[PDB]
């Protein structure tokens, strides 16, 4: 009968859709690897899919996936155990090294462009004519680290222009240089910005950017990695 036929058909359709869904989702990260970076012996039942090509705008590159990949960076990690499945101890300082929770990715060393080919992110002081329009304005507040010491003061907000939201606080350090702080990791209070991830002596260590007026994708990832990284690695200085 037709009802019984429909339900059995649908199940077959469902096995096939999951099949497609699973393969679509293997366009990055595969084939799987041993802890040593070589193709793993057992890959599972799903094959890699046929390649596809994204063409980016403003002639910003084009991408085909899946395809061989490498980290494009060196990884200061070493084995702690004689078999599969254990952790890899940083061979250095994981903060500086870009490993663990402080990991970052070799993304393109250029700024994200908007639909009109302008830098998506800019300092407010250089984006006609953006302004804090509601809420507490952080520009001018002292920045306190998680050791309860002042690390510097907030001199600007870096804004996503097309989206119209605040992405970074630009912070002046006691030597006169600045670093970018993820907005998404600061607590704006009445009389300060409090930053839990970092202790005040880790700020000088934040990654710096090549130009006062734009941030690249790679620059972004390094800054974001380093700051999140402090949650675990600053932790000794907590301690309060």
């Amino acid at each position: 009968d037709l009802a019984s036929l429909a339900i059995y058909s649908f199940w077959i359709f469902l096995a096939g859709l999951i099949y497609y869904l699973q393969t679509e989702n293997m366009r990055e990260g595969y084939p799987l690897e041993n802890e040593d970076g070589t193709p793993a012996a057992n890959q599972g039942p799903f094959p890699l899919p046929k390649p596809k090509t994204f063409i980016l705008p403003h002639g910003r590159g084009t991408l085909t996936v899946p395809g061989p990949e490498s980290e494009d960076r060196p990884i200061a990690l070493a084995r702690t155990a004689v078999s599969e499945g254990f952790p890899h101890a940083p061979t250095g300082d994981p903060m500086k090294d870009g490993v663990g929770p402080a990991s970052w990715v070799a993304r393109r060393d250029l700024p994200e462009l908007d639909g009109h080919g302008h830098n998506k992110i800019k300092p407010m002081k250089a984006a006609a004519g953006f302004h804090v329009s509601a809420g507490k304005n952080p520009i001018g507040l002292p920045v306190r680290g998680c050791d309860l010491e002042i690390a510097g003061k907030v001199v600007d907000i870096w804004v996503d222009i097309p989206e119209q939201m605040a992405r970074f606080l630009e912070v002046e350090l006691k030597d006169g240089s600045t670093r970018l702080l993820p907005m998404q990791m600061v607590k704006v209070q009445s009389n300060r910005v409090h930053v839990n991830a970092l202790s005040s002596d880790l700020f000088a260590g934040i990654p710096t950017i090549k130009s006062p007026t734009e941030v690249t994708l790679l620059e972004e990832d390094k800054i974001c990695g380093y700051v999140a990284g402090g949650l675990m690695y600053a932790a000794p200085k907590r301690k309060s």
Partner: protein
């Protein structure tokens, strides 16, 4: 409970976003409407602009027509009394024609004719809007996924109000326009068909409805968790993967043994949702055209 990212600490504002042009006839765009500080804590502050358009106006005109046809009848049930209308608002009902008129358009206004009028308006209202989601897509040079997904919703609705009634051979099978009346119709439908818990498509549809809430809570929370790396910039993470797309997949992988990619997560999503009404529409279409009783059918698969 650190900085927990459901509401924004600081809002900013700049020159107004009139938006992408591509092949969009700019004469048809309203200006930007008001800014809401209230929205700005949660989403965007900017209201507007909207694209007017011919199809847009046909859609919006016909839509109101529908809403008004139903409303005009409710005032007639309220005896033209404002207090009665307000008291019995959810009890009013624009019911289809009686079984005997079958599939014909010759029902009296007070006897299923107004329902057919209102349905006609509803029908052009939806389909004209569907063509919209395609066109606004086309003007910007975009994929057709929205019109595609929308079609799955339109499928359930068509089956309920149009396709099944025609296959039963009468408009009395269709759904009345009323708040509570539409709920009673629903319950009755199940009762009069052996209980929809025995319809395999009802339980598939539930699985997907539940699964869409499972999936959206997973996606929503995941993105908020990695937004300290700008993970909510999903198109840029597709073209040039960052550590947010990486920690995201590694969470799921270490948790449950597999993971998605920024692009493929959005493929799971569309299907999770479109399957709801897809399986549901088939469920309802078979009911009474092919199976009077799902329990009985259940008890043999035959």
């Amino acid at each position: 409970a650190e900085y927990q990212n459901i509401f924004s600490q600081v809002q900013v504002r700049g020159p107004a976003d009139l938006g992408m042009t591509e092949d969009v006839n700019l004469a048809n765009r309203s200006g930007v409407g008001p800014f809401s500080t209230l929205l700005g804590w949660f989403g965007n502050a900017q209201l507007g602009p909207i694209y007017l358009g011919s199809l847009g106006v046909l859609s919006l005109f016909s839509g109101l027509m529908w809403f008004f046809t139903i409303g005009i009848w409710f005032w007639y049930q309220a005896g033209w009394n404002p207090a009665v209308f307000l008291r019995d608002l959810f009890f009013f009902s624009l019911e289809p024609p009686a079984p005997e008129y079958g599939l014909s358009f010759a029902a009296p206004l007070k006897e299923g004719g107004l329902w057919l009028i209102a349905s006609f308006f509803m029908f052009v209202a939806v389909w004209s809007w569907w063509g919209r989601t395609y066109l606004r897509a086309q003007a910007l040079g975009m994929g057709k996924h929205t019109a595609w997904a929308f079609l799955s919703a339109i499928w359930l609705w068509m089956v309920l109000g149009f396709i099944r009634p025609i296959l039963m051979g009468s408009w009395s099978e269709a759904v009345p326009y009323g708040i509570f009346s539409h709920l009673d119709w629903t319950n009755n439908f199940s009762l009069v068909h052996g209980n929809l818990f025995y319809n395999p498509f009802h339980g598939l549809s539930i699985a997907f409805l539940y699964g869409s809430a499972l999936l959206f809570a997973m996606h929503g929370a995941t993105i908020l968790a990695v937004s300290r790396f700008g993970g909510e910039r999903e198109l840029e993470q597709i073209a040039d993967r960052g550590t947010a797309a990486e920690r995201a997949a590694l969470f799921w992988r270490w948790t449950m043994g597999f993971n998605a990619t920024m692009e493929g997560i959005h493929r799971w999503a569309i299907w999770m949702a479109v399957l709801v009404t897809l399986t549901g529409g088939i469920g309802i279409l078979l009911s009474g055209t092919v199976v009077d009783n799902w329990y009985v059918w259940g008890q043999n698969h035959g």
